[PDB]
Design a protein around this ligand. Structure first.
Ligand SMILES: [Mn+2]
Ligand SMILES: [Mn+2]
Ligand SMILES: [Mn+2]
Ligand SMILES: [Mn+2]
Lengths: 194, 194, 194, 194
């Protein structure tokens, strides 16, 4: 079955941007719950599919998307954060400049759509292989990023920030750029180009 | 095993002048057939994604399974719901109808109204909620199957279900279809639901 | 313009079920923000409507639903909570028993659907004037309860509980029944019947 | 002021054999007319709700405004987008087409494919994104207007736009419509967008 991946750092390593308690709960409780429920839903869906219960299989889809998406999204997120993540590779910077003018503009545009999410969700920087272009998007709830390869995600569920930032989501979204793991994001970019 | 197109319980022209032989023919042989063919292919792709552990790909296939699978579910029910010689609601069904909607005429008006009001493609339904032990009415978008209640009688209001015969005049179609509601089938489904 | 209503109690009066800091932020920050943004969006929508910019008016709808809904929902919520809210009136209890069997069953069923909300939203007990029946429902994000009269709401946005309960939404949803303002809920029921 | 049904820029039979006189006639005189009539009524109800301060009622009217208003918007554009004597894309539009899609034939294939794939009722669009200064393609559900980009060319794939002539065979319709794309209008709209 699916497993909760270990974090690539210790729970306090992203302070002062994200607190120890937030990281601990987010990993050990929130992500764990998506994993546990994902495993259960896959079992129920298998039973429905194997027995020919099409209506029930369809009825189970939202729970698979939510918990499956939760596992997908958090798994990427932990790799996207670092205490010392460096700067974009030269190839990614050049592409950011082509597609957004500058890193400043990319940060502002993605922060803005991310901040604007109504309710729970995620902001993403992605790479579209078909159009050979960087794109930004948001996703509701735990819906996974579709139609482009995920490069950098920003979780704006309230659980991601509230204990530290309270209501002030913009401060969290602006601050998270300080701990963006550009080594990882650049590796994902390089893999997305191949 | 592979899904198949169910034979209709009557010949393509049996429902005239309420529904034309050409509508029935296209509706069964092209529309339903396409949902069945696409459903089989989508189930194969989903089975591959599940077996490979491609969770993102499995989630991405969900809309196509809901649409084609729902199409199969809905139309398969819809054929059993139609007859030239409808008959009448069983005693127990008529009594529950009077209980929950006051009269059959009220039920017909109320279901007809919501069905006519559908914006875009969809369906209207009479169902039975086992939990509350009551009859309810609802609409569904596109081919979304009826959820939360057991389906008893469905009215397809996709433009393909009427445009050839009724043109833009959907209310004529929805009012007329009551003349061919298969109450024998509906009472059976009600009995099974209780 | 719209205004932030004063709470009918002091910020610590719902302890130990809901904390002082949660109540203070929820009222002074979260609800205030919906009010402020609601006022701004109404202005922009007026300009679009008055100048004949239909496309722009439509584009502004989600922001009106979200902030408007936020104002509607929180305004009801503050009246629905009390340190000593009593018990249901006799007329409401009788109706709860008719429509749900018992208060216990109602609490369990509404708590269950409320707990199950994926992402941000609300659980509601409402009264449907047409069917003359109590119903339970959930709403996503700040979508207002539609199709029935709201009687009792449970906010399950993470901001409603996280500072105190952390991830453990079920404990908050089960506990909130201890501070349900049955005087208010019963008054709303009596008004909904007229 | 009150919305009105715009005259078509051509006679109902001018587009044959690609689109039939009966389709054009019904499409303009019944479908578009109904969106216009319903839009006027909904705007009145909305104006009343706003003026009374009935915020819940104003929010509840939003789906009907989006559907009927979008219907008006979309079809009004669609008539200007069709011609027997289309002409050809301006130099500047053809050059941008080659830039963003490689060729016109690629653009046609790509837009045709997504338009054909619409599940239920909707539209396909060529638009211009002013922010990124690029051409994009998209689909919309039901009568949702195209958002985030300026509309240039729209293809209506509601079954009413083709079933009388093409029956179930939507791809014939979508491929054929390119023979009557009004490139003079599209280049104008492109010019205006830049
Ligand atoms: Mn999270
Ligand atoms: Mn059909
Ligand atoms: Mn709240
Ligand atoms: Mn149309």
């Amino acid at each position: 079955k699916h497993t909760l991946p270990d974090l690539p750092f210790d729970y306090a390593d992203l302070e002062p941007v994200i607190s120890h308690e937030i990281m601990q709960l987010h990993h050990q409780k929130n992500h764990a719950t998506y994993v546990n429920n994902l495993n259960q839903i896959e079992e129920k869906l298998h039973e429905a599919v194997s027995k020919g219960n099409l209506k029930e299989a369809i009825a189970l889809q939202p729970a698979l998307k939510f918990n499956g998406g939760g596992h997908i999204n958090h798994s990427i997120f932990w790799t996207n954060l670092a205490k010392d993540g460096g700067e974009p590779s030269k190839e990614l910077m050049d592409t950011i400049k082509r597609d957004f003018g500058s890193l400043d503009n990319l940060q502002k545009r993605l922060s803005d759509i991310t901040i604007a999410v109504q309710g729970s969700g995620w902001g993403w920087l992605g790479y579209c292989k078909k159009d050979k272009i960087l794109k930004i998007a948001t996703c509701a709830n735990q819906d996974p990023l579709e139609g482009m390869v995920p490069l950098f995600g920003i979780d704006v569920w309230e659980h991601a920030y509230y204990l530290q930032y309270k209501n002030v989501r913009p401060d969290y979204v602006h601050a998270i750029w300080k701990i963006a793991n550009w080594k990882n994001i650049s590796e994902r970019f390089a893999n997305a180009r191949q």
